[PDB]
Ligand binder design. Structure first.
Ligand SMILES: O=C(NCC1(O)CCC(F)(F)CC1)c1cc(=O)c2cc(F)ccc2o1
Ligand SMILES: O=C(NCC1(O)CCC(F)(F)CC1)c1cc(=O)c2cc(F)ccc2o1
Ligand SMILES: N[C@@H](Cc1c[nH]c[nH+]1)C(=O)O
Ligand SMILES: N[C@@H](CCCC[NH3+])C(=O)O
Lengths: 485, 485
């Protein structure tokens, strides 16, 4: 091919057109209808039917060019993810506005054009615009990749625009993401929740990103969660409150982790465990039904080259008590307290015998996390499920379980072995909140009285992955965090 | 009453309750109605009328303790208020001693009441308890009725502002309604909401130092975005023809009453739109937003603070359009000959600034001089209606398409409310051969073909300030970043 030459020559064309008094980047073309609107309005035409008296102005990007016949030229025109044909017939051209062949020979794949013409269908039944006049609105100076010729993630994740133009499923993925967020926002708002914005950077502060604030001469931390200020709003009497926005984790990158991701966190005064579980079941089932018209979906867990599985979002979903289950499968009691030297040693021994990676550092909470990932988190690939009743030492903001000492009223929901949701009743007794005696501001706010409250957070990117059949978070974030090329 | 001793005694109370087998922070109280729903259901009851057969569970925060045999409180929830009338006559004596129960209650305590609806003889809608449970105690003395004018406290303990100042909750409810109105306005027009990166590889801009941070695993310096403009334009190239984002942008600069280093913007791009379409979108949005909130286009604003008379701002469209160079030349009795960056015109501008005893921008570039002249001579032109400043010079507007009829100018508009910029918009300069930056990821995307496009940005915080009658931007941000205590 030689793309460099293609580009040099198209740049010369631009200059050339300008020499003839043609602006290949003109100011304004007044369109009368969009491509989706045109398809909706004309899709019932009969084969070969022309509405020669209906004159429309339309725009779009040319994505295919062909001819045979100097006097009959055909293009694909795309707009808003939809497509029509352009049938340029010598006889329908306005010859006073220019030479036909000259007008149409200069069009290349990628060009954005403005068409004045009439609607009809080809004898084959393809919905088409029949131009009297076609003008360039903006040129494509590069050779675009061919359809099915853009697989390189280095280009798709950086030059996302090329991915959107060439890979049809890419636009669908990002459409689905926005419909998920719209669904959630509406779901919450119909339940009386009040959306807010809290600060993206905090004084005191998951390993954080740090940034210097010039006006205050302070080094501040990007938020890792929106939890603290939301709870302060509950204290303030906003009894159902939430935020949907970005949080930042200066950690690793992989198929389920990006350094900024979008969370939805809500707090719900006077709610319990049971309300959070029901919320979760209601929300997931109703979202999937909204998107798909069924509770069951297909997901390629092990990639596009292997057979998919079915994930069923029909509620209710299984609940697995983390400690009881670890103890059962390992036939070992993890005696409380879980951070005793003896119980730590026991967890390390189990980890050592199953050749599970020892975490670093090997703290009781991280040991319990590793045990759960090994023995439980992959238990159910065919339905979402909750891991519940986590130890206090894993869950310092969660209220004590009312009948299982040492545990909490916490739930964490997993889809195919990946965490997408964490929720719990908030520990609201300041004399039991060990992290006070945590941002000193939080501690203080508890002393003014936090009602009994339930809190919940969702990972919007991971949810989108499952509902768009993607195996990497990079495929559901328009511009994922990447080093320069 | 001494605040330290008050707190110490409430802490001692908590522990004494626990020592008597009472949990002053119980897990769950199951409420059956909210305070707003209660007011709505029972507001028509005849005086002194009781529905003693309707047993309800209600919760709220006690905000007044009036009150033997008969105890009176104010109970608040969701920004509304009812009376509590606790009568010995109706108390469930099985559950506890009437005076022991009600003697323990203090202003700010959150409580759960089992009781019945009625009005008092005197006419006051009330809940009548049979039983009252502490759900979460206020350990501190709450500031009273007024007496929380202190901005430090309102901004550092926003929860106290929200509990004590009725107008606080209103300000922030209004803010959420503005954003909701905007999202819906856009969505009904076919715009598609996206999230672009908070962290990018662009080291700020000409008038905006960046927040800098660093991802440790990548070993990569990153910068907080100063605007969403670049990725949104790339999505226009990618065929998302009407695209927007509402979220935070970051400029690591000084703080004042109209500038916060983190602030909320909405930016949209609209392919195939012009100048005039952006003017009209602006008049439609502002007028309809104000009508939506107030039921009139005319609002009152204390431009000179609460201690001075307000002015009326009329949002009835259309709004005035003032051409920047023409108006400077008129008010200043000068002619500013192009090019505006000639030593002569620079000299003329510098001398106007000196002679008027206006601070001279440093360095004195043509764009900065023009900026200073507009700010002094034109940005206060109208205070009784919003207005547009239009047709900025190319030299001040390097991403704006050239004006079709006036040499050296652009298709740009900025809207001002009481001398403050709330919107900036223009037709995008899309010929890469005319974009001065293209001697970049921008310039590469322009080479693939950006259609003729209109772009617009709104300052959400400043718009909220005017629609909530605030003079400082910290008044419309829940938790603004403050110099630590
Ligand atoms: O969705 C995710 N996690 C699930 C949640 O923990 C998310 C927060 C919650 F919504 F509150 C509860 C459920 C997630 C996505 C990432 O890209 C990511 C990146 C990191 F560097 C570190 C953690 C990360 O976590
Ligand atoms: O609302 C503001 N400006 C108006 C806009 O320029 C906002 C960006 C646009 F929306 F795209 C077009 C209109 C504003 C608010 C601040 O708090 C602020 C702080 C700074 F450090 C620097 C500039 C700032 O500007
Ligand atoms: N029950 C299994 C669980 C396990 C996997 N790896 C280690 N242990 C054994 O092995
Ligand atoms: N009554 C609810 C609060 C709002 C719905 C609860 O139990 O949480």
């Amino acid at each position: 091919v030689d793309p460099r030459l293609y580009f040099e020559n198209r740049s010369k064309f631009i200059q050339d057109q300008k020499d003839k008094g043609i602006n290949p980047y003109p100011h304004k073309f007044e369109r009368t209808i969009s491509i989706p609107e045109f398809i909706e309005k004309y899709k019932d035409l009969g084969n070969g039917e022309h509405l020669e008296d209906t004159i429309l102005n339309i725009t779009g990007r040319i994505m295919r060019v062909s001819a045979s016949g100097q006097k009959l030229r055909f293009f694909d025109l795309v707009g808003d993810g939809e497509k029509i044909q352009v049938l340029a017939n010598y006889s329908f051209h306005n010859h006073e506005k220019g030479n036909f062949a000259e007008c149409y020979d200069k069009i290349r794949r990628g060009d954005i054009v403005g068409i004045v013409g009439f609607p009809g269908k080809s004898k084959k039944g393809e919905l088409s615009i029949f131009p009297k006049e076609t003008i360039l609105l903006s040129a494509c100076l590069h050779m675009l990749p061919m359809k099915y010729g853009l697989k390189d993630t280095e280009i798709r994740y950086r030059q996302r625009y090329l991915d959107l133009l060439i890979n049809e499923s890419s636009r669908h993925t990002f459409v689905t993401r926005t419909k998920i967020i719209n669904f959630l926002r509406n779901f919450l708002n119909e339940r009386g929740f009040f959306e807010v914005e809290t600060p993206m950077m905090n004084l005191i502060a998951a390993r954080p990103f740090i940034t210097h604030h010039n006006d205050l001469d302070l080094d501040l931390y990007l938020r890792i969660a929106t939890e603290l200020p939301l709870k302060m709003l509950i204290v303030g009497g906003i009894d159902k409150v939430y935020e949907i926005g970005k949080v930042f984790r200066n950690e690793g990158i992989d198929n389920t982790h990006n350094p900024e991701f979008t969370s939805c966190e809500f707090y719900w005064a006077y709610a319990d465990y049971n309300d959070l579980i029901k919320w979760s079941e209601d929300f997931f089932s109703q979202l999937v039904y909204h998107l798909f018209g069924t509770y069951k979906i297909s997901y390629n867990k092990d990639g596009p080259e292997n057979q998919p599985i079915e994930i069923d979002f029909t509620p209710p979903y299984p609940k697995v008590s983390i400690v009881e289950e670890i103890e059962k499968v390992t036939n070992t009691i993890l005696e409380q307290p879980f951070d005793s030297n003896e119980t730590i040693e026991k967890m390390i021994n189990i980890i050592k015998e199953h050749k599970i990676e020892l975490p670093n550092p090997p703290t009781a909470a991280k040991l319990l996390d590793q045990l759960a990932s090994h023995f439980i988190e992959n238990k159910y690939n065919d339905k979402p499920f909750f891991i519940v009743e986590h130890p206090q030492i894993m869950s310092p903001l969660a209220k004590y379980h009312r009948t299982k000492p040492g545990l909490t009223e916490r739930l964490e929901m997993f889809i195919c072995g990946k965490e997408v949701l964490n929720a719990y009743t908030e520990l609201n007794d300041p004399f039991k909140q060990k992290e006070c005696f945590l941002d000193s501001a939080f501690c203080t706010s508890l002393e003014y009285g936090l009602p009994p409250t339930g809190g919940l957070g969702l990972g919007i990117d991971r949810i989108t992955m499952f509902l768009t059949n993607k195996n990497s978070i990079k495929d559901v974030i328009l511009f994922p965090t990447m080093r320069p090329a």
